[PDB]
Amino acid sequence: GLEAKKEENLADWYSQVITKSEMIEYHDISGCYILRPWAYAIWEAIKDFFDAEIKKLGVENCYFPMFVSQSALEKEKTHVADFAPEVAWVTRSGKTELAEPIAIRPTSETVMYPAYAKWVQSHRDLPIKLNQWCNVVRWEFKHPQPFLRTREFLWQEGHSAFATMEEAAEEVLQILDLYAQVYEELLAIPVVKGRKTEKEKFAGGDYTTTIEAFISASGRAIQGGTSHHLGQNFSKMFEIVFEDPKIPGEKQFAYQNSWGLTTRTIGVMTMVHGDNMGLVLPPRVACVQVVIIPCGSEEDKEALIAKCNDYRRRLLSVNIRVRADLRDNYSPGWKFNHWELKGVPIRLEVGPRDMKSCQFVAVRRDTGEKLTVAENEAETKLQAILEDIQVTLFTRASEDLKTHMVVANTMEDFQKILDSGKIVQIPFCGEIDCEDWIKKTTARDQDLEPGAPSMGAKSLCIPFKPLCELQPGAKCVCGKNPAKYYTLFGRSY
Amino acid sequence: GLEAKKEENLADWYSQVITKSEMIEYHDISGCYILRPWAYAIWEAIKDFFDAEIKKLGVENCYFPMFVSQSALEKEKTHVADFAPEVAWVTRSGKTELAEPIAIRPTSETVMYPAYAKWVQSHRDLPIKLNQWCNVVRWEFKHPQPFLRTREFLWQEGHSAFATMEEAAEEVLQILDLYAQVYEELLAIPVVKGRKTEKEKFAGGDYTTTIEAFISASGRAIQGGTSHHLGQNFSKMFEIVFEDPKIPGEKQFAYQNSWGLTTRTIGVMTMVHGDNMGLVLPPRVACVQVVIIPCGITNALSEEDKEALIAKCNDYRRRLLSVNIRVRADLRDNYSPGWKFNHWELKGVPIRLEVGPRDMKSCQFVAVRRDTGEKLTVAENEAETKLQAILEDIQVTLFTRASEDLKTHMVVANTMEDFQKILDSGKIVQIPFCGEIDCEDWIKKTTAMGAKSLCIPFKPLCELQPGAKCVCGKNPAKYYTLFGRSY
Ligand SMILES: COc1cncc(-c2cc(F)cc(CNC(=O)c3cc(N4CC[C@@](C#N)(C5CC5)C4=O)cc(C)n3)c2)c1
Ligand SMILES: COc1cncc(-c2cc(F)cc(CNC(=O)c3cc(N4CC[C@@](C#N)(C5CC5)C4=O)cc(C)n3)c2)c1
Ligand code: PRO
Ligand code: PRO
Ligand SMILES: [Ca+2]
Ligand SMILES: [Ca+2]
Ligand SMILES: [Ca+2]
Ligand SMILES: [Ca+2]
Ligand SMILES: [Cl-]
Ligand SMILES: [Cl-]
Ligand SMILES: [Cl-]
Ligand SMILES: [Cl-]
Ligand SMILES: [Cl-]
Ligand SMILES: [Cl-]
Ligand SMILES: [Zn+2]
Ligand SMILES: [Zn+2]
């Protein structure tokens, strides 16, 4: 059984849950983790939903090399200056030096965009809308944490190039909403949509959009997905130019977006919904939504496992994902425990009394509530229960966010509420340095709550729909500049 | 259209087809290639079929790290010695030199098997059947060739551990059959199942089963998929051990297999079926099976007639969708009909569906088969049926053509002179073989590019007459072995 407790040692509870649920195995190279089938299946459920959605938008899947030349890596100065200290460099094969060191992709702008420059020669050659599912490497020497901050991670990155800013601007928001659907409709996690501040925005892009999620267990917020408008900052460096019908002789730079989402998702799903029995899966991504365990003679034993398989096939035929744990090797209760740790939404108990009274027992994982269900009603009732679990999870999580995201209009209120464990929308002047000073003084003036994290606030996002509307001539919390917008600040992952 | 001929310079033809069908772009780093969506789609078709099949076998997908440590990498000494000259090494991040060089996976035995040791505590913990779709790197400095021989490629690698040799041996043949089905039912390419000679087997394994394919245009064979019985060679090194259920205290080492399939498939599909018109897609993997091109839309035609025309194309598109034919309707304004014929012929779309104004007014259409070029006029009401029939018939005939190729280019020979210029005939030869490595090196050296072993076929063309001597003459033949020139 799981014995670590979430409300105490969050990090050890995280370790124990992600290992005992068999989602994650440790590797002998720090910051790289083994994604076992139980986690990978969640990634695939995401993969399937998102791939369908971007296909409806004209995006096509492809695969670009993992290595980058130095010369191409340094064409956009802002971008490479941001990523350079964390780029893994391959320098030899065997004992033989390469001709020239090659970089492993931290992100694939500099891999893809020379190809885009090749493929664009006329207005009719745009848009280009490419996506790939691949790994990238970002070799930070800070302490890694499974799913959340790792040095190799699986992700998808989409890269689109348009002839007009309007097309591009349209796609940035479409994609961001899709990410919000991934979080809220699949992982049952509510998120805040907004723009990044100048400080936090993607180096080399015009503006970045983001969804933020709140982990109430640590009081911290984490960026769940991101979608950037790069504008013409990359096309002018890689010469992605077309020559217009309307505009003779004048080279036109493509307008570009890139957008990304990673297995960080799974980590967030653990931190929000997980409890002290283990993992809790939302039904829409759970590898197995219903697990059938036989409970409690010889003819009776064979007929019992046949009834379990009856339920298995019945559920299979209604697109409920289902496993029959029919091993002679472990108790009923050990299976209860194993599948509770793995977070299966419904446990299906079938014992001979229930088997001959034509019924069964359904145990919900989120609440623990046990129901007796008539055999006849399985396909119906379990579907309903599955549906109700998903809603329940989302509802609980949303009630958390709403109670932890409040407004403060002065620095002192912001400080007190932020040390209270919440994330705060404050009037903000926008300037990078203001954000630095915010970070510095919220760390300096922090009144430490028991077990609370000791760090400064960062900006999370500028919400599209702020809680309040910035009253006219409001100063920023810095006092000295007029506020430009309400910004969501908090302590971050 | 396309200019280079396949029968002349095969390599120039090949580069032209793979770029002009928008499958492959070149990267500024030699040996790595961009799989554009036309190619990636084929890979995803192969993925869907194989993923489903190995799911049925009990294999689950995972993802293991791309980096392996120096210590773990050399634990099985044979395998590491085979791959070391071509392992890429990461030595720094930014400017800071790493404390230890870390390696990029060339294959993943030495990433996964320490975890397998962690996960096999008891006999109940077996079998372990994991597979992953990922990229690997084999930084060889020989001349690359897209799809076939590349420094980085996508593949699947399945790694499985069992408590007995019997279920391991079972799975090896099962996976080899799946690979044969990918080649023959999906890509419409016939292959030859066999075992690698002692020389050509996976280093650190006990035996390697393989499917070999034949590119007739160069006279060369190539290994299309492989499936190894690693035996106990890796479990004795990474200590993957379980206690015998019946003998208390005695530990047993797991028996393991690994099997792999790469994007080389697409390259083979290009070499066997491609022609001087361009790429040729087997309907079963074709991203697009039918393309609907409206013709006749000159400016003289009425807006009434133009909108009726494209509406009729949309009718066809939805009706083929209604029967699970993968149809694109290319209704674009800016490109000409001839430009579209060429575009989609180069990409090798199996059927082109031309609907012009007159055709519409006679409730009929023109279907053009990519492979042979026949134009069939077809009544409107029979679309869904007839198009289905043609798609089937394309796949069949592609396979049939290739198969006859194979059967004429694979012949028996019992002596090395016949072997020698049957081989310089542009063919592959089955010869009686002693199996010894000295003699394999000898056959390579004599046959000069010299000939290499390909496989010891499950089903040889002829049975060995007893006392048959190997072609060395010095020793007696152990088995008919398929030899030839190789990719
Ligand atoms: C504040 O500094 C840190 C503090 N503590 C630890 C680290 C750290 C430690 C490591 F050992 C390795 C790393 C490198 N990995 C990552 O930076 C990272 C970023 C993301 N990100 C970033 C935003 C994004 C979204 N949405 C973008 C789409 C991409 C998304 O998912 C996802 C993952 C799995 N990993 C960082 C860094
Ligand atoms: C006589 O030798 C050579 C001749 N000419 C060129 C090279 C060479 C040149 C390079 F620039 C890079 C490389 C490295 N890549 C590969 O070796 C390779 C092997 C396979 N393989 C090997 C067998 C297999 C099957 N079926 C196994 C499943 C795995 C399968 O698909 C597939 C791919 C795409 N790449 C080799 C080597
Ligand atoms: O790393 C990023 O944030 C962007 C989005 C995906 C690719 N590059
Ligand atoms: O590369 C090979 O040949 C084996 C089988 C696939 C993974 N490793
Ligand atoms: Ca950085
Ligand atoms: Ca206090
Ligand atoms: Ca100022
Ligand atoms: Ca070698
Ligand atoms: Cl525990
Ligand atoms: Cl090199
Ligand atoms: Cl919003
Ligand atoms: Cl639901
Ligand atoms: Cl809660
Ligand atoms: Cl290091
Ligand atoms: Zn300010
Ligand atoms: Zn011999």
Side-chain angles (χ1 to χ4, degrees), chain A residues 1-54 56-94 96-243 245 247-296 300 303-326 329-352 354-369 371-386 388-415 417-447 450-464 466-474 476-479 481-493, chain B residues 1-2 4-7 9-296 300 304-305 307-391 393-437 439-443 445-458 460-464 466-468 470-473 475-487:
Chain A
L2 185 86
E3 278 146 354
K5 291 213 185 159
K6 206 185 160 187
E7 56 281 1
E8 335 213 291
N9 222 283
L10 191 54
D12 190 56
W13 169 94
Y14 192 75
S15 172
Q16 295 294 117
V17 159
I18 67 180
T19 53
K20 277 169 142 67
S21 72
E22 304 190 329
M23 279 199 307
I24 277 276
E25 189 49 71
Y26 294 111
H27 191 35
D28 61 0
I29 288 184
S30 148
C32 319
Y33 304 105
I34 310 182
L35 296 183
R36 300 175 75 188
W38 204 251
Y40 198 82
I42 310 187
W43 187 234
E44 308 234 72
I46 298 166
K47 211 157 145 168
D48 288 326
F49 164 84
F50 188 73
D51 217 281
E53 288 307 302
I54 62 174
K56 300 187 223 165
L57 297 175
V59 190
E60 284 194 293
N61 288 345
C62 70
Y63 183 75
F64 278 78
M66 178 200 38
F67 295 114
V68 201
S69 54
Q70 181 179 4
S71 99
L73 184 53
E74 288 191 279
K75 284 203 166 290
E76 222 285 333
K77 280 73 187 45
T78 308
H79 179 230
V80 78
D82 197 38
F83 280 91
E86 62 211 278
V87 166
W89 286 92
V90 180
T91 63
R92 65 182 163 96
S93 160
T96 296
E97 291 329 271
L98 299 190
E100 157 193 348
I102 56 186
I104 300 179
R105 47 161 184 244
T107 184
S108 305
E109 278 75 354
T110 66
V111 183
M112 295 173 191
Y113 290 165
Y116 283 37
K118 295 185 186 199
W119 300 332
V120 181
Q121 297 299 315
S122 148
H123 66 300
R124 65 205 207 146
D125 293 319
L126 299 153
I128 289 164
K129 291 145 118 173
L130 293 179
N131 170 72
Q132 62 179 359
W133 302 90
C134 72
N135 61 326
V136 288
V137 178
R138 306 187 180 188
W139 201 267
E140 295 227 10
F141 289 101
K142 294 197 209 157
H143 174 257
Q145 191 173 9
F147 291 128
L148 302 192
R149 308 135 325 170
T150 59
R151 315 224 278 231
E152 170 185 14
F153 50 83
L154 289 179
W155 80 346
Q156 62 79 39
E157 63 180 304
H159 297 253
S160 35
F162 304 87
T164 45
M165 208 182 308
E166 183 215 89
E167 274 166 286
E170 204 188 58
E171 188 203 51
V172 166
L173 289 179
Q174 282 167 308
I175 295 307
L176 185 78
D177 184 67
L178 282 179
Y179 291 162
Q181 288 184 249
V182 171
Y183 271 74
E184 288 180 332
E185 288 170 24
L186 270 58
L187 307 181
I189 295 164
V191 304
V192 174
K193 295 182 199 166
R195 192 205 103 172
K196 289 299 214 186
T197 57
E198 287 293 310
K199 171 165 183 180
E200 288 302 323
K201 80 180 217 173
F202 189 69
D206 249 8
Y207 57 88
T208 288
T209 61
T210 181
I211 48 164
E212 304 290 309
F214 181 59
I215 297 158
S216 77
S218 57
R220 330 241 292 285
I222 183 178
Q223 170 177 215
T226 194
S227 184
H228 320 290
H229 181 64
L230 324 169
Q232 299 186 309
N233 292 310
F234 280 82
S235 59
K236 290 181 187 185
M237 293 300 108
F238 288 96
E239 291 276 316
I240 310 171
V241 297
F242 63 103
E243 232 169 49
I247 319 197
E250 167 133 24
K251 314 257 68 196
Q252 314 263 107
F253 297 96
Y255 285 95
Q256 285 178 277
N257 309 325
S258 79
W259 26 270
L261 171 90
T262 82
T263 45
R264 158 171 299 172
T265 44
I266 300 164
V268 194
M269 184 220 74
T270 309
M271 287 290 204
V272 181
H273 303 309
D275 67 11
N276 286 344
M277 263 169 276
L279 204 60
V280 178
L281 295 165
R284 276 212 54 187
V285 294
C287 186
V288 168
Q289 304 161 303
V290 192
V291 62
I292 310 169
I293 301 89
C295 298
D300 292 309
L304 186 61
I305 61 199
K307 180 53 60 172
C308 294
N309 276 285
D310 291 357
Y311 283 116
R312 189 191 90 109
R313 292 187 291 279
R314 289 179 60 192
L315 288 184
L316 269 197
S317 151
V318 304
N319 310 311
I320 290 169
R321 313 185 285 286
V322 54
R323 173 140 327 128
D325 186 351
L326 306 182
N329 315 96
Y330 322 83
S331 75
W334 180 96
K335 298 173 182 197
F336 292 16
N337 175 81
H338 179 86
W339 301 108
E340 277 165 52
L341 272 171
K342 312 200 74 173
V344 172
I346 297 171
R347 167 168 80 234
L348 210 85
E349 317 205 355
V350 191
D354 289 89
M355 194 243 280
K356 299 174 255 209
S357 172
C358 286
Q359 53 190 51
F360 66 98
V361 173
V363 200
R364 312 180 38 136
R365 174 61 182 84
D366 60 347
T367 74
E369 166 188 83
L371 258 283
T372 305
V373 194
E375 172 166 38
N376 162 244
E377 285 290 79
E379 297 102 359
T380 325
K381 184 66 176 206
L382 297 183
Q383 184 55 37
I385 296 185
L386 282 178
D388 189 72
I389 292 175
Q390 180 81 19
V391 159
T392 298
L393 284 177
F394 183 69
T395 299
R396 289 164 155 177
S398 321
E399 275 156 6
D400 278 339
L401 175 59
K402 178 204 46 185
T403 56
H404 281 85
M405 191 172 75
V406 304
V407 184
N409 283 321
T410 81
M411 187 85 218
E412 259 188 2
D413 296 333
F414 176 37
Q415 191 68 48
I417 293 161
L418 171 89
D419 298 350
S420 157
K422 288 158 165 55
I423 61 181
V424 196
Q425 287 177 17
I426 73 186
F428 182 45
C429 82
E431 298 184 329
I432 307 179
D433 158 73
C434 193
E435 190 160 343
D436 289 341
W437 172 87
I438 281 177
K439 195 202 185 203
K440 174 181 249 79
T441 59
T442 55
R444 186 197 59 206
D445 300 333
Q446 164 164 16
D447 165 5
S454 74
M455 54 200 314
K458 293 211 295 223
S459 79
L460 314 167
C461 78
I462 307 155
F464 293 152
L467 292 158
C468 292
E469 227 53 74
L470 196 52
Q471 283 301 60
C476 174
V477 290
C478 68
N481 306 138
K484 263 171 211 121
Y485 25 58
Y486 269 108
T487 310
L488 182 59
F489 271 75
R491 298 178 174 110
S492 324
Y493 269 97
Chain B
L2 187 102
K5 312 254 204 51
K6 194 188 184 196
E7 36 272 4
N9 181 206
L10 190 52
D12 286 4
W13 172 87
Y14 183 68
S15 152
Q16 283 311 296
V17 171
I18 67 188
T19 39
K20 288 182 92 70
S21 52
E22 311 190 338
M23 277 194 313
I24 282 306
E25 193 52 70
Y26 302 110
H27 193 40
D28 46 47
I29 304 183
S30 148
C32 308
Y33 304 100
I34 307 171
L35 300 175
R36 303 182 71 190
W38 201 250
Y40 198 76
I42 296 163
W43 185 238
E44 246 175 326
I46 295 167
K47 205 162 171 191
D48 296 336
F49 171 84
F50 192 77
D51 222 37
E53 289 313 314
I54 72 179
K55 215 139 288 196
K56 297 192 209 137
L57 285 170
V59 186
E60 281 171 342
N61 286 347
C62 53
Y63 186 80
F64 283 80
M66 170 205 37
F67 292 125
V68 55
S69 72
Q70 220 152 24
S71 147
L73 182 52
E74 301 160 69
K75 259 150 171 305
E76 211 290 336
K77 313 294 229 134
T78 305
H79 162 250
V80 62
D82 198 64
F83 281 76
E86 58 252 8
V87 155
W89 284 96
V90 171
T91 52
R92 69 189 165 81
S93 152
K95 295 155 185 174
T96 87
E97 179 191 67
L98 290 200
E100 253 206 292
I102 62 181
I104 300 175
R105 50 160 175 247
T107 166
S108 310
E109 277 78 359
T110 61
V111 181
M112 312 170 58
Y113 290 173
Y116 281 29
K118 295 200 252 189
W119 296 335
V120 183
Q121 322 181 3
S122 149
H123 76 281
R124 308 161 327 189
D125 294 293
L126 290 182
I128 290 171
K129 286 163 153 169
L130 296 168
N131 165 80
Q132 76 185 358
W133 302 92
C134 67
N135 56 319
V136 298
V137 170
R138 304 201 177 168
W139 208 271
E140 275 180 61
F141 301 101
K142 284 157 124 139
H143 192 219
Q145 194 172 191
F147 294 121
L148 304 191
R149 295 283 196 185
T150 57
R151 301 192 212 222
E152 180 195 20
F153 48 90
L154 296 185
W155 77 349
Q156 64 81 67
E157 57 180 316
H159 298 256
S160 61
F162 307 77
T164 83
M165 177 159 180
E166 62 197 356
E167 33 171 349
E170 196 184 20
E171 179 195 83
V172 169
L173 300 185
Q174 276 174 318
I175 295 305
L176 192 76
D177 200 352
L178 284 177
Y179 292 159
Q181 296 180 41
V182 180
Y183 273 83
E184 293 190 346
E185 304 176 351
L186 259 51
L187 304 172
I189 303 163
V191 286
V192 186
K193 296 177 166 207
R195 287 157 208 275
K196 294 299 193 180
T197 66
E198 154 152 39
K199 175 182 179 164
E200 288 286 315
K201 89 181 168 158
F202 196 61
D206 279 338
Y207 54 96
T208 298
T209 59
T210 173
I211 48 164
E212 307 283 308
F214 179 61
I215 285 86
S216 63
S218 55
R220 315 247 295 284
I222 188 182
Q223 174 175 24
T226 191
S227 151
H228 317 289
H229 179 56
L230 310 177
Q232 293 189 314
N233 289 283
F234 284 71
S235 48
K236 289 200 244 203
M237 296 302 115
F238 291 105
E239 231 66 31
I240 306 154
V241 284
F242 61 97
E243 185 153 336
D244 185 322
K246 296 188 145 162
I247 270 45
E250 190 68 17
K251 72 189 205 138
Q252 298 316 146
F253 302 85
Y255 306 73
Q256 302 173 267
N257 313 326
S258 53
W259 27 275
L261 183 70
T262 82
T263 39
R264 169 177 287 182
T265 40
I266 301 189
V268 189
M269 185 222 64
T270 307
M271 293 278 197
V272 175
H273 300 318
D275 57 30
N276 291 319
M277 185 148 337
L279 189 82
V280 169
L281 295 167
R284 175 68 155 276
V285 288
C287 162
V288 170
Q289 277 167 332
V290 193
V291 60
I292 296 168
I293 293 153
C295 328
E304 166 163 40
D305 276 356
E307 291 188 317
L309 179 61
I310 70 90
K312 175 62 66 170
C313 312
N314 275 317
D315 281 325
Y316 285 115
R317 186 195 53 100
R318 75 133 192 92
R319 299 166 44 193
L320 302 180
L321 285 186
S322 76
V323 280
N324 291 276
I325 296 197
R326 306 192 277 293
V327 49
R328 156 71 186 280
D330 184 342
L331 301 195
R332 287 174 281 179
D333 270 328
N334 40 343
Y335 306 96
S336 76
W339 185 95
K340 270 128 99 144
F341 291 5
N342 198 63
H343 188 75
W344 303 107
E345 277 165 14
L346 287 177
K347 291 170 133 186
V349 172
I351 300 192
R352 162 172 87 237
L353 207 172
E354 323 182 349
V355 175
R358 179 274 191 254
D359 290 320
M360 180 186 59
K361 304 204 215 217
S362 199
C363 310
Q364 52 191 44
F365 63 94
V366 179
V368 182
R369 324 184 38 194
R370 186 38 192 91
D371 62 348
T372 59
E374 336 182 10
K375 314 196 32 152
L376 309 113
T377 306
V378 177
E380 174 175 5
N381 84 78
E382 287 156 39
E384 305 105 322
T385 325
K386 182 81 179 183
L387 290 181
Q388 249 161 343
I390 300 174
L391 280 171
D393 190 56
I394 291 161
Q395 185 84 19
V396 183
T397 181
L398 287 173
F399 189 62
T400 295
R401 273 148 160 184
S403 313
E404 268 134 41
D405 272 85
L406 180 52
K407 217 192 61 204
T408 66
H409 283 100
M410 200 175 47
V411 297
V412 177
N414 293 294
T415 44
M416 193 147 327
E417 316 76 355
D418 308 318
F419 181 36
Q420 173 62 71
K421 99 154 165 210
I422 290 185
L423 183 98
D424 297 61
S425 157
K427 280 198 197 61
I428 57 195
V429 198
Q430 295 185 12
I431 67 177
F433 190 43
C434 74
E436 305 282 336
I437 301 90
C439 179
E440 201 158 328
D441 304 317
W442 173 61
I443 289 173
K445 209 176 173 63
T446 301
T447 56
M449 159 200 275
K452 174 197 292 219
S453 147
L454 323 167
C455 85
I456 314 163
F458 294 175
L461 284 165
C462 285
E463 288 324 300
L464 256 182
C470 174
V471 297
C472 35
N475 294 138
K478 274 177 184 157
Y479 22 64
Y480 266 120
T481 306
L482 187 62
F483 276 82
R485 289 183 171 102
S486 212
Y487 264 110

